[PDB]
Amino acid sequence: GSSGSSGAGKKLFKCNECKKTFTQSSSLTVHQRIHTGEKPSGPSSG
């Protein structure tokens, strides 16, 4: 079921932690650190 209302297009990079996107990679990268640098809550094993 494709109900693309908000986005779901022109995507190149997506975070498999908070389903976030960034027009560019660099932007996403700096955002990844957060998920890959936060208190040990659970075994990410990404």
Is residue 16 left, alpha or beta, with left meaning phi > 0 and alpha meaning psi from -120 to 50? Answer: alpha
Q: Does 15 bind Zn ion (CB under 5 A)?
A: yes
Could you tell me the smallest distance in angstroms from the CB atom of residue 40 to Zn ion?
A: 17
CA gap 29, 41 in Å, rounded: 21
Minimal CB distance to Zn ion: which residue? Answer: 15
Query: Quick one: tokens of 13?
Result: 């990079």
Residue (1 or 46) nearer to Zn ion, CB: 46
Stretch that binds Zn ion, among 2-10, 11-19, 36-44 (CB under 5 A): 11-19
